[PDB]
Amino acid sequence: MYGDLGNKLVLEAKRTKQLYARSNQDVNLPMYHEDIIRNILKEVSNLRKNTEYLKEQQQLGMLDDKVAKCQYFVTLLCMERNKRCLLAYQRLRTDILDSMAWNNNGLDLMSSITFSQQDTNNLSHQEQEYLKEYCDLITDLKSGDLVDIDLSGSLVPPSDVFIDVRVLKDAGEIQTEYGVFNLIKDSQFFVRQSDVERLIQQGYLQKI
């Protein structure tokens, strides 16, 4: 009746989780609802001006009635009921882009955040200062450890040394370090395990 649109907001917030977390690991975040959150920002605007009238009459009119006392509560209680939703949708928004701050936290062309969600690069580019902050705040954490332990993925445990790997959808010469592998089209590889983790998460080598 009062905070009704927040129930509509948190309902469509639920679909953002079930699209991502049930299907796969690709995010494809939908949209920021500036049109929706402007309405509750419009309603809280009128509500704060509603109490300062009664904050003014309380010394001049009814003289702080107990009947008038709980009238401040209904104007109080509607705020945090609104304030609960309008950050809960804000957290579940930003606690899913941290995936992109971890799965592609720097493997190849890291600062290129382009060719990815450019239509929602008015959403996320306006919050890129947080994204960039996480980015830069993960770079020093790759070096804050006094010994270089990798943090860019490799979460599945290893099995053995030798793995048959194919390749497709790729060209050009890559892998300047650990020996150049001469990556040409549709070529089998049969290599040591420990050199391919920075390309599988890159998505250049295809199949195990």
* Footprint on this chain of another protein (rule: CB under 8 A): 1-3, 7, 10-11, 13-14, 17, 23, 25, 28, 41, 44-45, 48, 67, 70-71, 73-74, 76-81, 83-88, 90-92, 94, 98-99, 102, 127, 130, 133-134, 137, 141, 144-147, 149-151, 154-158, 160-162, 166, 168, 185-186, 192-194
Cβ 59 to another protein shortest distance, Å: 18
Residues 6+ apart with CB under 8 A from 75: 47, 50, 51, 54
CA 186 to chain centre: 35
CB of residue 153 vs another protein: minimum separation in angstroms? 9
Reference 195, options 149, 156, 162; nearest CA is: 162
Radius of gyration of the chain (CA): 26
Long-range pairs for 57-62 at CB < 8 Å and ≥24 separation? Answer: none
**In this complex, which beta carbon is closest to another protein, that of residue 59 or of residue 188?**
188
Q: How far is the CB of 72 from another protein (least distance, A)?
A: 9
In one letter, which amino acid is 43? E
Cβ at position 201, least distance to another protein in Å: 14
